[PDB]
Amino acid sequence: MDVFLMIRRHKTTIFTDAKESSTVFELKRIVEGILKRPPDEQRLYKDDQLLDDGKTLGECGFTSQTARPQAPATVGLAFRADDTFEALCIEPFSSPPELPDVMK
Amino acid sequence: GRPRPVLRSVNSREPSQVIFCNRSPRVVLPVWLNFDGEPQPYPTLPPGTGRRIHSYRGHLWLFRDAGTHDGLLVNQTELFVPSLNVDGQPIFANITLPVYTLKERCLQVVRSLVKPENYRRLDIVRSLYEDLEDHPNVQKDLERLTQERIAHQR
Amino acid sequence: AMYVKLISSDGHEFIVKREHALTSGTIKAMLSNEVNFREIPSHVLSKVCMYFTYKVRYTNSEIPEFPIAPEIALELLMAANFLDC
Amino acid sequence: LVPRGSPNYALKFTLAGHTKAVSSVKFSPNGEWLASSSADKLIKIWGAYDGKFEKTISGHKLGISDVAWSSDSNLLVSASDDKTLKIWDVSSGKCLKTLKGHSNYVFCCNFNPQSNLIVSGSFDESVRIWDVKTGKCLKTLPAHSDPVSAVHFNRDGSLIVSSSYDGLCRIWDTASGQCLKTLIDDDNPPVSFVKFSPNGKYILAATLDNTLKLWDYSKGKCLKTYTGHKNEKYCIFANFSVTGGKWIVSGSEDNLVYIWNLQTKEIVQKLQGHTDVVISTACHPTENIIASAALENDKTIKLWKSD
Ligand SMILES: [K+]
């Protein structure tokens, strides 16, 4: 089935979809189309965990049950330039205010 | 030379076997429009359930959230009219959620959290008060459906 | 395959398909390639982007509910109203 | 060329005791009384000649659709939306038996001439034959596939005729309960009323296309048609009048009683006065007296008399 993703670096979030059968490499070829950085300059994470180019999205844990259009899964992105590796850093979204009295 | 309400069952007296299939997350209210165009509430269906029921050729149904009266679809459209069963097979009425606008979906949720008395307490633009108070109902939908019908013919 | 950048009030950038974003007539007018919102924060605008995705997928498809927690409901109503989606 | 025959029915009394629609009026065989049934769940008994209220009979829990007398005029049977018939002692007003068995409204009822049997018809599409003495159901006939509008015995009780919204009249062998004959027209509109003729050789049937027909049912032969009234919705009774001239009588949805010549089929009188549908009419057994009864916007019984 289809999986729905948020690719996140710093204060940028990319909305994209893919297949469970798609590879991490194929996913990076997607990000390249958008950010113009080749796959070999990209590092993708699920949480703290680096993803192998050869593995499929389903193999990494990205299922259709957990990567839904209305609640997409997050993929960490950090760049690399030869022997220099950028730290993975994803800035949190803002918080909602306290729930108003008339909803309590 | 009086018209009859356009949205009504035809009094066929010809039995038709139907399966109401709730493929929505809502409790479904089936509504039958009688021969005089007056809506009649039928027993509800919990979500994920299906039920074989007895109706008639040319009768007219619609389906609403039994709690809020939100409109549902049936076989991807708003109304359902049984025909005669062919070769001993029931007719399926697949009831699903529409793809609501985000606005209507938001209105559904706020309405579920705030009593109508309190809508104008909310710190939002005045026009949203009118939207919150504009509860979905069958009367309105009958009107809308007739209007769309008349547009299509003309 | 065309993409646009929607920027929340707190400076978060959301890169989404143009087609998905054009669900909002407001966004369509603001495009006429980036759009800055002055009052829509990142938690709310990410949620709206999730709606765009949900809308496009499940139009012409069994359809699930679009979930909305109580805590975001009012701000999301305001944004939905403003964006008219 | 002498003027055609024609009665001159003139209103004599209005009986305003019921508080809702009046469903049925019937003269007792002995001529003395009129019984009336109503949606107000009451039977009332009136003097046939003066329209003088005699008594109220109560006990049904919903509306009553029909009443009928026993041959000796001592018993009444009622048919109710509460899914029962009741057999009443006419002297004491007492309910002798409740006939329980129909699974929906009971619309119509009649004693056989001998009056040891009651026949009933229901919305449940069945026809039932009951034992008067014990109140036990003897037969349940799978009569019809739609609500049953009328049930009548013939002159010796050997036949029953039933009419249905399924567009059929059916003739039943009383003893076996088997159907001897059905008459299906091409135009199969709901059959709203039926009864055998005095001689037992014919059936008079109403359909809800504003038609009364006289059938010779053994020949499958429509002998006469009677039209000009309005009857598309309610199940309106019809009568053979035999005390004077030979007439057909029926109510109508235009609030009139219609009287036709039986042989020529011409209308010879319309009786005006009611302010709603006239659902029931009755003819007195010995005198030229008609009773008529109307629905909710009238709620009255009228007594009409002729030379
Ligand atoms: K039924």
XYZ file of C-alpha atoms in Angstrom, chain D residues 19-305:
287
model
C -65.141 11.828 19.023
C -63.182 10.599 16.013
C -63.811 9.119 12.606
C -66.672 6.600 12.371
C -65.454 3.437 10.654
C -68.607 1.374 10.236
C -72.387 1.322 10.612
C -74.540 -1.833 10.648
C -78.282 -2.429 11.199
C -79.215 -5.366 13.419
C -81.038 -8.190 11.512
C -84.179 -7.672 13.633
C -84.355 -4.041 12.436
C -84.322 -2.503 15.928
C -80.774 -1.110 16.238
C -77.842 0.545 14.513
C -74.298 -0.249 15.684
C -71.454 2.149 14.973
C -67.676 1.656 15.317
C -65.043 4.398 15.570
C -61.360 5.336 15.758
C -62.280 6.554 19.287
C -62.208 2.831 20.279
C -65.956 2.795 21.026
C -68.969 0.995 19.695
C -72.279 2.789 20.138
C -75.766 1.366 19.743
C -78.600 3.558 18.414
C -82.311 3.074 17.721
C -82.662 2.357 13.983
C -85.845 4.413 13.610
C -85.249 7.476 15.827
C -81.403 7.433 16.048
C -81.773 7.455 19.873
C -78.515 6.633 21.684
C -78.857 3.347 23.538
C -75.421 2.421 24.913
C -71.637 2.679 24.577
C -69.553 -0.497 24.359
C -65.894 -0.145 25.355
C -62.863 -2.387 25.800
C -60.658 -2.150 22.701
C -57.301 -0.483 23.320
C -57.074 1.062 19.819
C -59.372 2.198 16.979
C -62.145 -0.113 15.716
C -62.466 -0.716 11.961
C -65.603 -2.874 11.704
C -68.567 -4.397 13.542
C -71.021 -7.169 12.652
C -74.212 -8.650 14.142
C -75.214 -12.239 14.783
C -78.345 -13.555 13.062
C -80.314 -13.401 16.329
C -79.169 -9.771 16.919
C -77.863 -10.753 20.416
C -74.119 -10.634 19.634
C -71.771 -8.120 18.026
C -68.237 -8.804 16.817
C -65.676 -5.935 16.491
C -62.345 -5.771 14.604
C -59.632 -3.516 16.058
C -56.249 -2.002 15.291
C -55.236 -3.641 18.606
C -55.051 -6.892 16.574
C -58.040 -8.552 18.284
C -61.676 -9.061 17.580
C -64.092 -9.071 20.524
C -67.481 -10.743 20.786
C -69.939 -8.632 22.752
C -73.261 -9.398 24.419
C -75.529 -6.616 23.056
C -77.765 -6.590 26.188
C -75.112 -6.168 28.878
C -72.323 -4.426 26.875
C -70.024 -7.206 28.177
C -67.019 -8.600 26.276
C -67.532 -12.358 26.074
C -64.421 -13.368 24.113
C -61.300 -11.723 22.798
C -60.209 -13.338 19.526
C -56.409 -13.257 19.602
C -54.250 -14.468 16.714
C -53.843 -11.789 14.047
C -50.349 -10.285 14.093
C -51.527 -6.847 12.878
C -54.631 -4.662 12.590
C -57.949 -6.427 12.122
C -59.877 -4.545 9.471
C -63.055 -6.509 8.748
C -65.352 -9.098 10.306
C -68.613 -11.017 9.719
C -70.641 -13.844 11.271
C -71.824 -16.716 9.071
C -75.663 -17.001 8.686
C -75.753 -19.783 11.293
C -73.535 -17.490 13.455
C -71.399 -20.270 14.968
C -68.428 -18.904 12.959
C -66.796 -15.495 12.642
C -64.630 -14.590 9.663
C -61.950 -11.855 10.010
C -59.420 -10.121 7.727
C -56.227 -8.292 8.666
C -53.339 -6.111 7.556
C -51.330 -9.280 8.265
C -52.602 -10.641 4.847
C -54.469 -13.538 6.533
C -58.125 -14.567 6.786
C -59.163 -16.339 9.997
C -62.268 -18.376 10.847
C -63.223 -18.424 14.536
C -65.447 -20.495 16.764
C -68.049 -18.232 18.370
C -68.764 -20.444 21.424
C -65.103 -20.964 22.456
C -63.459 -17.971 20.721
C -60.763 -20.354 19.359
C -59.336 -19.830 15.846
C -60.294 -22.844 13.675
C -58.428 -21.842 10.492
C -55.817 -19.401 9.279
C -55.957 -18.934 5.487
C -52.835 -17.694 3.618
C -55.353 -15.615 1.747
C -53.410 -12.722 0.270
C -49.990 -11.184 -0.120
C -51.223 -7.696 0.914
C -53.613 -6.296 3.611
C -57.137 -7.761 3.598
C -59.922 -5.187 3.155
C -63.138 -7.275 3.404
C -64.487 -10.750 4.237
C -68.023 -12.065 3.609
C -69.904 -15.386 3.975
C -72.427 -16.505 1.330
C -76.112 -17.218 2.001
C -75.507 -20.666 3.546
C -72.008 -20.027 4.944
C -70.416 -22.579 2.569
C -68.249 -19.888 0.951
C -66.166 -16.941 2.070
C -65.060 -14.138 -0.229
C -61.997 -11.995 0.580
C -60.622 -8.816 -1.047
C -57.063 -7.542 -0.800
C -54.762 -4.715 -1.654
C -52.996 -7.337 -3.799
C -55.763 -6.690 -6.391
C -57.476 -10.090 -5.917
C -60.863 -11.282 -4.724
C -60.735 -14.920 -3.679
C -63.479 -17.431 -2.985
C -62.797 -19.902 -0.160
C -64.412 -23.251 0.699
C -65.498 -22.709 4.324
C -65.015 -26.350 5.363
C -61.605 -27.082 3.777
C -60.267 -23.547 3.807
C -58.950 -24.189 0.232
C -59.359 -21.458 -2.385
C -61.966 -22.465 -4.997
C -61.494 -19.528 -7.397
C -59.587 -16.266 -7.672
C -60.554 -13.378 -9.961
C -57.530 -11.418 -11.169
C -58.283 -8.573 -13.606
C -55.663 -7.178 -16.021
C -56.053 -3.850 -14.232
C -55.164 -5.270 -10.796
C -55.694 -2.158 -8.556
C -56.311 -2.688 -4.801
C -59.661 -4.341 -4.071
C -61.128 -2.242 -1.261
C -64.443 -4.017 -0.627
C -66.321 -7.199 -1.482
C -69.498 -9.037 -0.558
C -71.813 -11.652 -2.077
C -75.129 -10.613 -3.638
C -78.481 -11.571 -1.929
C -78.940 -14.525 -4.305
C -75.346 -15.681 -3.530
C -74.644 -15.987 -7.289
C -72.721 -12.637 -7.496
C -70.019 -10.602 -5.850
C -70.009 -6.813 -5.575
C -66.410 -5.512 -5.546
C -64.911 -2.050 -5.138
C -61.509 -1.187 -6.547
C -59.531 1.985 -5.784
C -59.926 3.298 -9.355
C -63.400 4.726 -8.568
C -65.195 1.539 -9.697
C -67.785 -0.841 -8.262
C -68.315 -4.061 -10.215
C -70.912 -6.843 -10.023
C -69.274 -10.178 -10.919
C -70.804 -13.504 -11.766
C -67.800 -15.180 -10.210
C -68.490 -18.712 -11.411
C -68.526 -17.506 -15.077
C -65.747 -14.915 -14.697
C -68.180 -12.343 -16.016
C -68.539 -8.663 -15.128
C -72.318 -8.072 -15.285
C -72.471 -4.435 -14.219
C -70.209 -1.485 -13.437
C -71.047 1.467 -11.197
C -69.097 4.733 -11.542
C -69.273 8.490 -10.989
C -68.262 8.480 -7.336
C -64.745 9.004 -6.003
C -62.868 6.117 -4.396
C -59.098 5.956 -4.708
C -57.887 5.807 -1.100
C -60.291 4.612 1.606
C -61.951 1.207 1.867
C -65.545 2.220 1.422
C -68.421 -0.188 2.057
C -71.183 -0.812 -0.500
C -74.741 -2.162 -0.168
C -77.524 -3.912 -2.023
C -80.777 -2.083 -1.208
C -83.730 -4.477 -1.673
C -86.642 -3.160 0.483
C -87.996 -0.797 -2.175
C -86.418 -0.387 -5.601
C -83.294 -2.365 -6.455
C -80.319 -0.108 -5.772
C -76.571 -0.128 -5.161
C -75.435 2.211 -2.358
C -71.899 3.428 -1.544
C -70.075 6.267 0.167
C -67.545 8.407 -1.692
C -64.498 10.554 -1.030
C -66.444 13.614 -2.267
C -68.523 13.406 0.963
C -71.673 12.139 -0.841
C -73.633 8.894 -0.588
C -74.315 7.550 -4.112
C -77.349 5.486 -5.105
C -77.425 3.647 -8.442
C -80.051 1.627 -10.280
C -78.759 -1.944 -10.098
C -79.923 -2.929 -13.605
C -79.375 0.292 -15.625
C -76.289 1.399 -13.558
C -77.465 5.048 -13.651
C -77.032 7.283 -10.613
C -80.526 8.044 -9.283
C -79.601 9.920 -6.081
C -76.611 11.573 -4.381
C -77.123 12.311 -0.654
C -75.389 15.501 0.468
C -74.662 16.619 4.065
C -71.485 14.919 5.300
C -68.323 17.034 5.504
C -65.808 14.200 5.115
C -65.333 10.900 3.261
C -68.327 8.609 3.720
C -66.558 5.354 4.575
C -69.592 3.233 5.558
C -73.243 2.911 4.568
C -75.868 0.402 5.641
C -79.381 -0.424 4.443
C -82.179 -1.345 6.848
C -83.419 -4.986 6.475
C -87.180 -4.192 6.110
C -87.599 -0.386 5.625
C -86.147 2.149 3.167
C -83.575 3.546 5.594
C -79.911 4.233 4.865
C -77.238 4.942 7.467
C -74.002 6.676 6.483
C -70.840 7.452 8.489
C -67.933 9.800 7.826
C -64.289 10.270 8.810
C -62.471 12.635 11.168
C -63.687 16.026 9.887
C -67.361 14.960 10.270
C -67.451 12.189 12.982
C -71.232 11.717 12.551
C -73.766 9.132 11.424
C -76.715 10.166 9.265
C -80.083 8.396 8.912
C -81.866 8.892 5.557
C -85.386 7.662 4.657
